[PDB]
Amino acid sequence: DDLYRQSLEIISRYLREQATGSKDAAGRRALETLRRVGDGVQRNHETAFQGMLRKLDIKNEDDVKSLSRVMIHVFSDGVTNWGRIVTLISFGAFVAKHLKTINQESCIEPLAESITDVLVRTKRDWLVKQRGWDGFVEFFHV
């Protein structure tokens, strides 16, 4: 499946460079947009993201394996929009920065996998209707 593979590459690349702190065509443009929008969501919701992090209490690989639960339950209100999706990915980047400080860099890849899994499994039809990553770039064009 091209959609899962493409989504995974974008989200994992974004989470890895956000943890490292150094920036590394359709996927390329989606990454540029995600860096602009994602870094913005992280700055604007920094206090709210800090509160969610403490409540989740991610300290090891086993906490990352159980992180998918909250993500499925937040999407249980029947609301889907690019704003919610980019907030989920930006929160994933925030968790990936915290994982890097507690020497849990190895947890970024499964975290990226978990975010992609929840996204592509529960919202495949919506993502496809929205022109996937082309639509993501177009929606956030400024």
């Epitope: 022109r131 990553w133 770039v137 177009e138 929606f139 064009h141």
Partner: single-chain antibody, 228 residues
């Protein structure tokens, strides 16, 4: 100056081929989905095809599948329509239209290019009328997969002109549209209201929405508004 300009139109024999071009100016072309919409002389708007920013998602109207191919060259700010196996029914002015990423409204349209080679899912009343200052209402009837699932856009087409975005996201006005125009959506229906009718409101009005079952844009048959 944000513009689109279509080229390549002309006279062709049935069975013949013709390639249209659309030149984009004053914007980042690589960040927009683009569309072709055609209009047979004296008839309504018919959506033809659309292509996303990185060409990953392409759609065609049933009437052109297999015969027409849409493409784009972002390095040349260019949209193309390769038309093969042309039929008399393909005779029309072909418009290039930019799609807004956040709303899917067609905010910029070219002047059109005439192609001479020699049913609408949304319905509207064919005519509407009023005296100056009166209030007129134009309905747009659809169903679950289109108006029932997606927002409605309205276009105004003055005589001899290209269509212009009038309303988007059911009831939002772009800049330059007077507040006498308003829109509403209820169930599978939508409506355009014009308060205090003015002479310049004499035009053809079209509603349009995305259809999830057809995977196509569907335009209403249009309403010819006369100001008596």
């Amino acid at each position: 100056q944000v513009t689109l300009k279509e080229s390549g139109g002309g006279l062709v024999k049935p069975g013949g081929s013709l390639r249209l071009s659309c030149a984009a100016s004053g914007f980042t072309f690589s960040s927009y989905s683009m569309n072709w919409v055609r209009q047979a002389p004296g008839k309504g708007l018919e959506w033809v095809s659309s292509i996303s920013s990185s060409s990953s998602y392409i759609y065609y109207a049933d009437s052109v599948k297999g015969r027409f191919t849409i493409s784009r060259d972002n390095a040349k700010n260019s949209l193309y329509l390769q038309m093969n196996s042309l039929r008399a029914e393909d005779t029309a002015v072909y418009y290039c239209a930019r799609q807004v990423g956040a709303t899917w409204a067609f905010d910029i349209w070219g002047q059109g290019t005439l192609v001479t080679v020699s049913q609408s899912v949304l319905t509207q009343p064919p005519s509407a009328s009023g005296t100056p200052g009166q209030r007129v209402t134009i309905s747009c009837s659809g169903s679950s997969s289109n108006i029932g699932s997606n927002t409605v856009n309205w276009y105004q087409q003055l005589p001899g002109t290209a269509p212009k975005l009038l309303i988007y996201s059911n009831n939002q006005r772009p800049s330059g549209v007077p507040d006498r125009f308003s829109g509403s959506k209820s169930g599978t229906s939508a409506s355009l209201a014009i308060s205090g009718l003015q002479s310049e409101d004499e035009a053809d009005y079209y509603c349009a929405a995305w259809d999830d079952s057809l995977n196509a844009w569907v335009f209403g048959g249009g309403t010819k508004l006369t100001v008596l």
